[PDB]
Design a protein around this ligand. Structure first.
Ligand SMILES: N[C@@H](Cc1c[nH]c2ccccc12)C(=O)O
Ligand SMILES: N[C@@H](Cc1c[nH]c2ccccc12)C(=O)O
Ligand SMILES: N[C@@H](Cc1c[nH]c2ccccc12)C(=O)O
Ligand SMILES: N[C@@H](Cc1c[nH]c2ccccc12)C(=O)O
Ligand SMILES: N[C@@H](Cc1c[nH]c2ccccc12)C(=O)O
Ligand SMILES: N[C@@H](Cc1c[nH]c2ccccc12)C(=O)O
Ligand SMILES: N[C@@H](Cc1c[nH]c2ccccc12)C(=O)O
Ligand SMILES: N[C@@H](Cc1c[nH]c2ccccc12)C(=O)O
Ligand SMILES: N[C@@H](Cc1c[nH]c2ccccc12)C(=O)O
Ligand SMILES: N[C@@H](Cc1c[nH]c2ccccc12)C(=O)O
Ligand SMILES: N[C@@H](Cc1c[nH]c2ccccc12)C(=O)O
Lengths: 71, 70, 70, 71, 70, 70, 71, 71, 70, 70, 70
């Protein structure tokens, strides 16, 4: 429960924050839908070892700021 | 007990800090409502591995400041 | 017992620092009342995984200064 | 025996540094009274997970300086 | 679990982020296709000890920024 | 044996550096008397979880410099 | 799964990133070919305790930037 | 055996570095005399949880420089 | 498996990076030959507790840059 | 095998670097003589919990530079 | 296997890097001869708790640079 985390702010409606399964197999286990202006703060966990952001978002990680772009 | 935490200051009444379940499943287990000017300082835990904020709020984490908008 | 802590200085009477329970269940277990000018320094612990401040206060955490407003 | 500590310097007589119990219960377990100019350097411990300061004092923690103020 | 991670932002369609198997044997176990403007934040794990990026992408690691070329 | 320590330099004769007992009970277990110009470097330990300085002294900790007054 | 990693960007076709075996024995166990513009981010592991880069590449480690030169 | 240490440089003959016992009891267990210009680098240990310097000395610790003054 | 590492870049042909055995005995167990412009990133390990560089090379460690000379 | 270390450079012949025993008992167990210009890099260990330098020497520790004088 | 290491570059022929035994006993167990311009990167280990450099050499440690004079 001490893992890194990412901060995602949706810059439009319908931004998808997608968790990919930890392990030998890689698939999406969850998509969190964010509407404009909502903020999600999400850890890497026993179940999530990779995170995909789809749509326009402002993203902060330990390595700095990055922005996803929609459509 | 040592884990990261988030600071959320409500900038309007009814800000909703939403704790999502750690584990194979993902659903909210708790929603803490804040009135304007109230501050919540909240850890990631055995039970919460993601936090969502709805409503207008000033948020600080280890990565800096971010603001949610309602 | 080296987890993080928050410093709260009441800027008016009747400030409440509230501890939220760690675990599957989330409820308030203690509200500490601070009057004007008193300072509480409070850890995250086995029993407290989130802290709510109600009323006007100057707060310090590892992420910097925030102020709760009455 | 590795915890954070607080430094408290009394700026008037009768400063109370109060230890609150670690655990499911929260209660006062000790009040240390300081005369003006005395310095207490106090850790968080197995028994103390929250500290209250009453009266005028100069306080240092890892988060910087704060001052308590008296009635 | 507390591992390092890599941030990849596709600057064109069809970018591939490829995980290479941890262990005595080295082969591809997964490729994640990213379209333009999508962001992947991927850890090293029990199963992935090297990551290859093919196509035009903006990459952030602990060592700074690097860019792959299409 | 890796706990924090405090540096106390007595600025007058008769300075007392007092160790308070770790545990459920809080009481003075030792008072080290310092004369003008002597330096005591003292750890927090299994037996000492709080230190009180009485008398005029220049004090250094991890949080910086502070001075006790006569 | 905590080790350091190396970032390799190929500046020409046919760059080889080569892993040397951990243990009493030292030999190449894998050579990953990178074409121009591809980026490999590769950890030290239970099986790799040394990494050789051959060909023209831009390399980042904790210690800073370095460039391999081909031919 | 990775604890803090203090550096003590005698600025006159007869500087006395005094090690105080770890434990419920507190008394000195060792006194190490230094002549002018001699340097002692001394750790906190299983047996020493506090160190007292008598006499004129230049002292460095993690918290910076401090000087003891003689009598 | 997270020890320190050295970065060696050969500035001429025939540079040798030589691993010395960990343990009570000290002998060379491997010499890696680097030709001009090749880079070797080599850890200290269970088997290697000292590394010797013979020949002209640019070297980076945690303590900074050093150059061996042929 | 991971402790702090001290660097000592002899500025004259006959510099002594003396190890004091770790434990309840304190005594010199080794004295390493350094001639002018020689450098000794010496850890704290299971057997050495204090180090004395006698003679003119340039010394480096984590806390910076200090000089012993003959 | 993550002790500190020292970097030694010989500035003349015949530089000796001597390892001193860890333990209650202190003696030289190995001396590594370095010719001019050769570089040795040597760790502190289970068997080596002090390192002596004889001859003219440029040295880097975590505490910065020092030169032995030969
Ligand atoms: N139940 C999920 C919640 C989660 C955390 N981080 C995520 C990132 C994306 C999607 C879901 C999540 C988990 O513990 O892993
Ligand atoms: N009982 C919850 C309290 C909590 C901590 N962080 C939160 C964030 C959001 C909502 C609830 C919480 C827990 O230990 O997980
Ligand atoms: N008994 C409580 C004391 C406490 C610590 N931090 C708090 C924050 C708010 C309220 C009470 C507390 C506990 O150990 O958790
Ligand atoms: N199931 C994969 C998911 C993953 C994490 N990082 C990756 C990098 C590339 C490809 C897949 C991944 C794993 O845990 O290892
Ligand atoms: N299977 C290899 C993958 C690898 C990691 N780093 C490398 C560097 C070079 C070559 C292969 C690798 C391993 O776990 O070690
Ligand atoms: N016996 C108390 C001493 C103490 C430490 N920090 C304190 C803060 C306030 C009051 C008492 C204390 C304890 O070990 O917990
Ligand atoms: N035998 C003593 C040596 C010592 C270390 N630090 C000291 C400070 C003062 C006096 C003696 C010492 C010990 O291990 O504790
Ligand atoms: N015997 C005491 C020595 C001590 C360390 N720090 C102190 C501070 C004050 C008084 C005594 C001490 C102990 O180990 O705890
Ligand atoms: N098999 C060797 C490989 C190696 C790592 N670092 C080295 C430095 C020099 C020579 C060989 C090596 C080992 O694990 O130790
Ligand atoms: N076999 C020696 C190699 C060594 C490491 N560091 C040294 C310093 C000097 C001489 C030899 C060494 C050891 O593991 O300890
Ligand atoms: N055999 C000694 C070698 C040593 C290390 N540091 C020292 C300092 C002084 C004298 C000897 C030493 C030991 O392991 O402790």
């Amino acid at each position: 429960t001490n893992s890194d985390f990412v901060v995602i702010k949706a810059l439009e409606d319908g931004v998808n924050v997608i968790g990919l399964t930890r392990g030998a197999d890689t698939r999406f286990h969850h998509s969190e839908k964010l509407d404009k202006g909502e903020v999600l703060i999400a850890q890497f966990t026993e179940h999530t070892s990779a995170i995909k952001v789809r749509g326009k978002a402002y993203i902060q990680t330990r390595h700095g700021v990055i922005e996803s772009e929609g459509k």
